[PDB]
């Protein structure tokens, strides 16, 4: 059923599964009109579809044109998400199609379920975890390729860079969500922490810096410390 802290290591067995995060699909800025009314301006968005075992990110860029002449956009965004996930699945060779898709937001269950009707043997599941995939657009390279795009377009990434060459999926996934947790709670500072030292760079084909094993420890500890500082501040603890 629902994914939570109990059935957490399932993400790392050898059943193909993907997470689908729909939070950055329909993005707007809110502004005032000449007459003083409020209006929205949509910007480009992205479906965040991630295999947590391998790091394979299928970033489906959502061009603002898709909304042109449409009503109930936040509702439509959910259906376009499911249409695009289904199309991803159909495009994958059978042996690669996922056996589970885990939506990060319960509202996506019914659109996905309806779009996946041709794949009855793929289970659509909710989750009770509080995953931080909305901060995907705080990763500079993902935000850049989304914002530059001029047409619908899919871009493949590995969100783990080359970490799996030295650590396990479980660990990889925890580093990732820790880094994104920090990025969600205080982007300025999280980014400060990653980029302070100009001598540790990001490879042209990577998303994150090329930290050594020792350096990843200092980083994870600074991420941790930031997150607990920000919680104290929010609640006065």
């Amino acid at each position: 059923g629902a994914m939570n802290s109990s059935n957490y290591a399932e993400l790392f067995n050898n059943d193909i599964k993907l997470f689908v995060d729909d939070t950055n699909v329909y993005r707007v800025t809110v502004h005032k009109t000449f007459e003083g009314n409020v209006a929205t301006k949509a910007i480009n968005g992205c479906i965040f579809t991630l295999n947590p075992k391998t790091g394979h990110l299928f970033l489906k860029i959502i061009h603002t044109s898709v909304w042109a002449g449409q009503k109930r956009l936040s509702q439509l965004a959910k259906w376009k998400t499911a249409e695009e996930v289904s199309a991803l699945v159909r495009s994958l060779p059978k042996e690669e199609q996922p056996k589970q898709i885990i939506v990060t937001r319960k509202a996506m269950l019914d659109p996905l379920e309806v779009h996946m009707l041709d794949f009855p043997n793929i289970a659509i599941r909710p989750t009770e975890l509080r995953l931080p995939f909305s901060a995907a657009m705080s990763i500079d390279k993902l935000s850049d390729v989304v914002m530059k795009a001029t047409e619908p377009q899919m871009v493949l990434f590995n969100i783990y860079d080359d970490w799996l060459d030295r650590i396990s999926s479980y660990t990889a996934f925890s580093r990732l969500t820790l880094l994104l947790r920090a990025l969600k709670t205080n982007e300025e500072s999280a980014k400060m922490i990653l980029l302070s030292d100009p001598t540790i760079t990001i490879k042209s084909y990577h998303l994150w810096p090329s930290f050594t094993d020792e350096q990843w420890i200092t980083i994870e500890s600074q991420m941790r410390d930031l997150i607990l500082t920000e919680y104290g501040r929010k609640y006065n603890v």
Binding site: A82, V114, D118
Partner: protein, 300 residues
């Protein structure tokens, strides 16, 4: 006016006939029910004084034969049987009514309640849901399952209701995924009305049969079927105007006849709030809305 005689009454049981019912004591001289209106379907039903669970009953139509009730002590229930001998049947009936051991079907003549609950129920359509074609009447009880419940086990005893499923290929045209699942009009009008039921009257008849099985036997699968048939209409932006006005009458009389104390298991909170206040058809169930509010404001 037709009659259903009872050979005997060996055990203490509560007998029901349509929306009427009587207590009959063990070996009370009770020999049947007289003055049953020809022209509608009827249902006679039983709840033993010992076993308050399993309510069970027979759906029938007098035009289709001479029917009677005999207790079977091996199987331990009142059974409906057909007497094929014309003469021998009028002979038992005349004797018992001359002996006056029979209760009269107690119809107030202002009351169109039974007619309103059964308007679209045809006996022929009943025998396609309770398939047992050696009998002109149909047996239902509290415990029978539906075909859709059997997909998620003995098919002889199945209630073969029409399968409705909002998340199915039948309901959702490829490419109109979003549109069909927010606006079920397609699924209602083309697939169900024009495809399977052929007309709104058979639709309504199953809907109404389903309600009555839920009410008289607390058949939980009938309750599901009834709500599904309601949700499908209320979730459809485009419905024949005649069907909307009939549905408001149908529901009015169902909600009116329901026992007040059973409103908790027989009425699905989500469906009813969706139909009355969220659906396309919120504004089209004026009678049903008004009764629901004044009688069961809690559920909403």
């Amino acid at each position: 006016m037709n009659t259903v005689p009872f050979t005997s009454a060996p055990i203490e049981v509560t007998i029901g006939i349509d929306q009427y019912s009587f207590n009959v004591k063990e070996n009370q001289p009770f020999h049947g029910i007289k003055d049953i209106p020809i022209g509608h379907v009827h249902v006679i039903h039983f709840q033993h004084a010992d076993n308050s669970s399993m309510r069970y009953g027979y759906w029938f139509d007098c035009r289709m034969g001479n029917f009677y009730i005999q207790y079977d002590p091996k199987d331990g229930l009142y059974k409906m049987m057909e007497e094929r001998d014309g003469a021998k049947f009028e002979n038992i009936v005349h004797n018992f009514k001359e002996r006056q051991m029979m209760v009269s079907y107690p119809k107030i003549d202002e009351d169109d309640t039974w007619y309103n609950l059964t308007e679209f129920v045809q006996m022929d359509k009943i025998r396609k849901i309770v398939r047992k074609d050696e009998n002109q009447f149909s047996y239902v009880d509290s415990s029978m399952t539906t075909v859709q419940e059997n997909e998620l086990s003995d098919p002889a005893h199945s209630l073969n209701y029409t399968v409705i499923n909002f998340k199915s290929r039948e309901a959702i045209r490829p490419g109109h995924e979003m549109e069909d699942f927010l606006d079920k009009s397609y699924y209602l009008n083309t697939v169900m009305l024009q495809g399977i039921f052929k007309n709104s009257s058979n639709y309504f008849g199953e809907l109404q049969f389903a309600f009555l099985n839920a009410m008289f036997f607390g058949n939980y699968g009938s309750s599901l079927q009834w709500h599904a048939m309601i949700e499908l209409i209320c979730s459809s932006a485009t419905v024949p105007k005649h069907m909307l006005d009939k549905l408001d009458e149908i529901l009015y009389y169902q909600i009116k006849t329901l026992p007040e104390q059973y409103s908790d298991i027989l009425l699905n909170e989500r469906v009813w709030n969706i139909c009355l206040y969220s659906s396309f058809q919120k504004n089209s169930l004026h009678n049903t809305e008004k009764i629901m509010e004044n009688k069961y404001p809690e559920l909403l």
